[PDB]
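Figure S7 source data.
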Amino acid sequence: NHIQHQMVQQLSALEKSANGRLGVAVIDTGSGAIAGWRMDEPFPMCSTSKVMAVAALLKQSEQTPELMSQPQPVASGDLVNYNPITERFVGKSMTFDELSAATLQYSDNAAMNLILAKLGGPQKVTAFARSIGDDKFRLDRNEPSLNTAIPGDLRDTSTPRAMALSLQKLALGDALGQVQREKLSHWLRGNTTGAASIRAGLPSGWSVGDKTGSGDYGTTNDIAVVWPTGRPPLVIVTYFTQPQQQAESQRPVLAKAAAIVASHY
Ligand SMILES: *C(=O)N1C[C@H](NOS(=O)(=O)O)CC[C@H]1C(N)=O
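C-alpha coordinates for the predicted NXL complex:
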Protein backbone atom coordinates (compact mmCIF):
# COMPACT_ATOMS: atom_id res chain seq x y z
CA ASN A 1 0.00 0.00 0.00
CA HIS A 2 1.56 3.26 -1.22
CA ILE A 3 -1.38 5.52 -0.35
CA GLN A 4 -0.54 8.92 1.03
CA HIS A 5 -1.82 10.01 4.42
CA GLN A 6 -3.95 12.72 2.79
CA MET A 7 -5.67 10.30 0.43
CA VAL A 8 -6.53 7.93 3.30
CA GLN A 9 -8.10 10.83 5.20
CA GLN A 10 -10.19 11.79 2.15
CA LEU A 11 -11.39 8.27 1.38
CA SER A 12 -12.22 7.66 5.04
CA ALA A 13 -14.24 10.88 5.20
CA LEU A 14 -16.03 9.99 1.95
CA GLU A 15 -17.00 6.56 3.30
CA LYS A 16 -18.35 8.11 6.51
CA SER A 17 -20.30 10.82 4.66
CA ALA A 18 -21.89 8.16 2.44
CA ASN A 19 -22.78 5.73 5.29
CA GLY A 20 -21.33 2.63 3.72
CA ARG A 21 -18.23 0.51 3.22
CA LEU A 22 -15.90 1.79 0.49
CA GLY A 23 -13.04 -0.13 -1.09
CA VAL A 24 -10.60 1.65 -3.42
CA ALA A 25 -7.41 0.59 -5.17
CA VAL A 26 -5.41 2.65 -7.66
CA ILE A 27 -2.41 1.38 -9.62
CA ASP A 28 -0.09 3.85 -11.30
CA THR A 29 1.24 1.57 -14.03
CA GLY A 30 4.15 3.92 -14.73
CA SER A 31 5.73 3.34 -11.31
CA GLY A 32 3.86 0.21 -10.24
CA ALA A 33 2.66 2.08 -7.16
CA ILE A 34 -0.59 0.83 -5.59
CA ALA A 35 -2.65 2.77 -3.06
CA GLY A 36 -6.10 2.75 -1.55
CA TRP A 37 -8.55 2.10 1.24
CA ARG A 38 -9.93 -1.23 2.51
CA MET A 39 -8.24 -2.66 -0.51
CA ASP A 40 -7.87 -6.17 0.99
CA GLU A 41 -11.40 -6.70 2.25
CA PRO A 42 -13.84 -8.85 0.25
CA PHE A 43 -16.57 -6.90 -1.57
CA PRO A 44 -19.40 -8.35 -3.67
CA MET A 45 -18.35 -7.90 -7.28
CA CYS A 46 -21.85 -7.98 -8.86
CA SER A 47 -21.58 -7.18 -12.62
CA THR A 48 -17.90 -6.29 -12.35
CA SER A 49 -17.28 -10.07 -12.29
CA LYS A 50 -18.17 -10.09 -15.99
CA VAL A 51 -14.71 -8.81 -16.96
CA MET A 52 -13.07 -11.97 -15.63
CA ALA A 53 -15.65 -14.14 -17.41
CA VAL A 54 -15.20 -12.45 -20.80
CA ALA A 55 -11.44 -12.55 -20.29
CA ALA A 56 -11.62 -16.32 -19.64
CA LEU A 57 -13.51 -16.75 -22.91
CA LEU A 58 -11.00 -14.57 -24.78
CA LYS A 59 -8.16 -16.71 -23.39
CA GLN A 60 -9.89 -19.80 -24.82
CA SER A 61 -10.29 -18.06 -28.20
CA GLU A 62 -6.48 -17.75 -28.46
CA GLN A 63 -6.36 -21.41 -29.51
CA THR A 64 -9.65 -21.35 -31.47
CA PRO A 65 -9.98 -17.85 -32.98
CA GLU A 66 -13.21 -18.76 -34.79
CA LEU A 67 -14.73 -19.44 -31.34
CA MET A 68 -15.82 -15.80 -31.02
CA SER A 69 -17.76 -15.88 -34.32
CA GLN A 70 -19.55 -19.16 -33.61
CA PRO A 71 -23.33 -18.59 -33.43
CA GLN A 72 -24.95 -19.45 -30.11
CA PRO A 73 -28.73 -19.98 -29.90
CA VAL A 74 -30.58 -17.69 -27.49
CA ALA A 75 -33.81 -18.95 -25.93
CA SER A 76 -36.55 -17.35 -23.85
CA GLY A 77 -35.43 -19.73 -21.09
CA ASP A 78 -32.02 -18.04 -20.99
CA LEU A 79 -33.56 -14.70 -20.01
CA VAL A 80 -33.21 -13.61 -16.38
CA ASN A 81 -33.68 -10.27 -14.60
CA TYR A 82 -31.98 -7.89 -17.08
CA ASN A 83 -31.56 -8.83 -20.74
CA PRO A 84 -31.37 -5.58 -22.73
CA ILE A 85 -29.67 -7.14 -25.77
CA THR A 86 -30.43 -10.85 -25.55
CA GLU A 87 -34.19 -10.35 -25.29
CA ARG A 88 -34.07 -9.18 -28.93
CA PHE A 89 -32.49 -12.47 -30.08
CA VAL A 90 -34.89 -15.04 -28.60
CA GLY A 91 -35.26 -17.83 -31.14
CA LYS A 92 -32.18 -16.57 -33.00
CA SER A 93 -28.42 -16.72 -32.42
CA MET A 94 -25.67 -14.39 -31.24
CA THR A 95 -21.95 -14.89 -31.56
CA PHE A 96 -19.70 -14.94 -28.52
CA ASP A 97 -18.32 -11.59 -29.69
CA GLU A 98 -21.87 -10.19 -29.60
CA LEU A 99 -22.50 -11.85 -26.23
CA SER A 100 -19.28 -10.39 -24.80
CA ALA A 101 -20.10 -6.88 -26.07
CA ALA A 102 -23.60 -7.21 -24.63
CA THR A 103 -22.46 -8.34 -21.22
CA LEU A 104 -19.65 -5.77 -20.93
CA GLN A 105 -21.23 -2.68 -22.53
CA TYR A 106 -24.89 -3.13 -21.53
CA SER A 107 -24.39 -5.52 -18.58
CA ASP A 108 -26.74 -8.12 -20.09
CA ASN A 109 -27.17 -10.88 -17.50
CA ALA A 110 -28.49 -13.55 -19.89
CA ALA A 111 -25.40 -12.99 -22.03
CA MET A 112 -23.25 -13.55 -18.93
CA ASN A 113 -25.03 -16.84 -18.26
CA LEU A 114 -24.47 -17.98 -21.86
CA ILE A 115 -20.77 -17.20 -21.48
CA LEU A 116 -20.60 -19.04 -18.13
CA ALA A 117 -22.17 -22.06 -19.83
CA LYS A 118 -19.51 -22.11 -22.56
CA LEU A 119 -16.70 -21.84 -19.97
CA GLY A 120 -18.00 -24.57 -17.66
CA GLY A 121 -19.60 -22.37 -15.02
CA PRO A 122 -18.60 -19.92 -12.28
CA GLN A 123 -16.03 -22.42 -10.97
CA LYS A 124 -14.13 -22.27 -14.27
CA VAL A 125 -14.08 -18.45 -14.18
CA THR A 126 -12.52 -18.80 -10.74
CA ALA A 127 -9.93 -21.24 -12.12
CA PHE A 128 -9.09 -18.70 -14.82
CA ALA A 129 -8.62 -16.00 -12.19
CA ARG A 130 -6.18 -18.31 -10.38
CA SER A 131 -4.34 -18.82 -13.69
CA ILE A 132 -3.57 -15.08 -13.83
CA GLY A 133 -2.38 -14.96 -10.21
CA ASP A 134 -5.60 -13.73 -8.59
CA ASP A 135 -6.15 -15.70 -5.39
CA LYS A 136 -9.03 -13.58 -4.03
CA PHE A 137 -11.56 -13.65 -6.88
CA ARG A 138 -14.29 -16.22 -6.39
CA LEU A 139 -17.35 -16.63 -8.58
CA ASP A 140 -19.80 -19.01 -6.93
CA ARG A 141 -23.16 -18.37 -8.60
CA ASN A 142 -24.55 -17.40 -11.99
CA GLU A 143 -27.02 -14.62 -12.80
CA PRO A 144 -28.92 -13.15 -11.12
CA SER A 145 -28.20 -14.61 -7.68
CA LEU A 146 -24.54 -13.60 -7.75
CA ASN A 147 -25.73 -10.05 -6.90
CA THR A 148 -27.25 -10.69 -3.45
CA ALA A 149 -24.31 -8.78 -1.88
CA ILE A 150 -25.03 -9.85 1.71
CA PRO A 151 -22.64 -8.45 4.38
CA GLY A 152 -20.33 -11.18 5.60
CA ASP A 153 -21.07 -13.45 2.63
CA LEU A 154 -17.88 -14.45 0.81
CA ARG A 155 -19.66 -15.72 -2.32
CA ASP A 156 -18.99 -13.80 -5.53
CA THR A 157 -16.43 -11.45 -3.94
CA SER A 158 -13.00 -10.09 -4.68
CA THR A 159 -10.82 -7.39 -3.15
CA PRO A 160 -10.06 -3.96 -4.62
CA ARG A 161 -6.36 -4.86 -4.76
CA ALA A 162 -6.83 -8.22 -6.46
CA MET A 163 -9.32 -6.85 -8.97
CA ALA A 164 -7.06 -3.92 -9.83
CA LEU A 165 -4.07 -6.19 -10.38
CA SER A 166 -6.17 -8.55 -12.50
CA LEU A 167 -7.63 -5.73 -14.60
CA GLN A 168 -4.09 -4.48 -15.20
CA LYS A 169 -2.85 -7.90 -16.35
CA LEU A 170 -5.86 -8.42 -18.64
CA ALA A 171 -6.37 -5.01 -20.27
CA LEU A 172 -2.79 -3.67 -20.20
CA GLY A 173 -0.42 -6.57 -19.49
CA ASP A 174 0.29 -9.95 -21.03
CA ALA A 175 -2.33 -12.25 -19.48
CA LEU A 176 -4.13 -12.35 -22.85
CA GLY A 177 -2.88 -12.39 -26.42
CA GLN A 178 -2.62 -9.08 -28.25
CA VAL A 179 -5.83 -9.40 -30.29
CA GLN A 180 -7.71 -10.47 -27.17
CA ARG A 181 -6.35 -7.73 -24.89
CA GLU A 182 -7.21 -5.09 -27.48
CA LYS A 183 -10.74 -6.46 -27.91
CA LEU A 184 -11.25 -6.40 -24.13
CA SER A 185 -9.90 -2.86 -23.84
CA HIS A 186 -12.12 -1.69 -26.72
CA TRP A 187 -15.19 -3.26 -25.13
CA LEU A 188 -14.40 -1.59 -21.77
CA ARG A 189 -13.88 1.77 -23.51
CA GLY A 190 -17.30 1.36 -25.14
CA ASN A 191 -19.20 0.74 -21.91
CA THR A 192 -22.56 2.54 -21.88
CA THR A 193 -23.40 2.31 -18.14
CA GLY A 194 -20.50 4.20 -16.57
CA ALA A 195 -21.11 7.93 -17.15
CA ALA A 196 -22.03 8.71 -13.51
CA SER A 197 -19.38 6.47 -11.89
CA ILE A 198 -15.54 6.61 -12.17
CA ARG A 199 -15.76 8.51 -15.49
CA ALA A 200 -17.59 11.43 -13.83
CA GLY A 201 -14.68 12.04 -11.46
CA LEU A 202 -11.90 12.09 -14.08
CA PRO A 203 -10.75 14.77 -16.54
CA SER A 204 -13.17 14.73 -19.45
CA GLY A 205 -10.40 14.42 -22.06
CA TRP A 206 -8.92 11.16 -20.77
CA SER A 207 -9.77 7.84 -22.44
CA VAL A 208 -11.45 5.43 -19.99
CA GLY A 209 -12.70 1.86 -20.09
CA ASP A 210 -14.84 0.60 -17.26
CA LYS A 211 -17.30 -2.00 -16.03
CA THR A 212 -19.95 -1.10 -13.44
CA GLY A 213 -22.03 -3.24 -11.15
CA SER A 214 -24.96 -2.89 -8.79
CA GLY A 215 -26.68 -5.15 -6.33
CA ASP A 216 -28.65 -5.43 -3.14
CA TYR A 217 -27.36 -3.61 -0.06
CA GLY A 218 -27.02 -0.56 -2.29
CA THR A 219 -23.92 -2.09 -3.81
CA THR A 220 -22.41 0.35 -6.32
CA ASN A 221 -19.25 -0.78 -8.13
CA ASP A 222 -16.95 0.25 -10.95
CA ILE A 223 -13.56 -0.94 -12.22
CA ALA A 224 -11.63 1.13 -14.73
CA VAL A 225 -8.55 1.43 -16.88
CA VAL A 226 -7.66 5.07 -17.46
CA TRP A 227 -5.33 6.49 -20.13
CA PRO A 228 -4.51 10.00 -18.87
CA THR A 229 -3.24 12.49 -21.42
CA GLY A 230 0.51 12.22 -21.89
CA ARG A 231 1.26 9.81 -19.04
CA PRO A 232 1.07 6.04 -18.33
CA PRO A 233 -2.32 4.46 -17.62
CA LEU A 234 -3.94 4.01 -14.23
CA VAL A 235 -6.18 1.22 -12.97
CA ILE A 236 -8.91 2.26 -10.52
CA VAL A 237 -11.30 0.01 -8.56
CA THR A 238 -14.11 1.62 -6.52
CA TYR A 239 -16.40 -0.79 -4.65
CA PHE A 240 -19.16 0.48 -2.36
CA THR A 241 -21.79 -1.36 -0.32
CA GLN A 242 -24.23 -0.18 2.33
CA PRO A 243 -25.75 -1.43 5.58
CA GLN A 244 -29.36 -2.16 4.52
CA GLN A 245 -30.55 -4.58 1.84
CA GLN A 246 -32.85 -1.99 0.25
CA ALA A 247 -30.32 0.87 0.18
CA GLU A 248 -30.31 2.98 -2.98
CA SER A 249 -27.27 3.08 -5.25
CA GLN A 250 -24.75 5.90 -4.76
CA ARG A 251 -22.88 6.36 -8.03
CA PRO A 252 -21.61 9.85 -6.95
CA VAL A 253 -19.54 8.12 -4.26
CA LEU A 254 -17.55 6.33 -6.97
CA ALA A 255 -17.14 9.56 -8.96
CA LYS A 256 -15.82 11.33 -5.88
CA ALA A 257 -13.51 8.44 -5.02
CA ALA A 258 -12.16 8.59 -8.58
CA ALA A 259 -11.69 12.35 -8.30
CA ILE A 260 -9.79 11.84 -5.05
CA VAL A 261 -7.42 9.28 -6.53
CA ALA A 262 -7.11 11.21 -9.81
CA SER A 263 -6.00 14.40 -8.03
CA HIS A 264 -3.20 12.63 -6.13
CA TYR A 265 -1.91 11.60 -9.57
C1 LIG B 1 -24.56 -6.07 -12.49
O1 LIG B 1 -24.10 -5.76 -11.40
N1 LIG B 1 -25.95 -6.19 -12.67
C2 LIG B 1 -26.44 -6.40 -14.01
C3 LIG B 1 -26.84 -5.00 -14.39
N2 LIG B 1 -25.66 -4.15 -14.27
O2 LIG B 1 -25.89 -2.87 -14.76
S1 LIG B 1 -24.99 -1.88 -14.04
O3 LIG B 1 -23.55 -2.33 -14.09
O4 LIG B 1 -25.18 -0.54 -14.76
O5 LIG B 1 -25.32 -1.81 -12.57
C4 LIG B 1 -27.93 -4.50 -13.45
C5 LIG B 1 -27.55 -4.55 -11.98
C6 LIG B 1 -26.87 -5.86 -11.61
C7 LIG B 1 -27.89 -6.96 -11.27
N3 LIG B 1 -28.54 -6.85 -10.02
O6 LIG B 1 -28.16 -7.90 -12.00
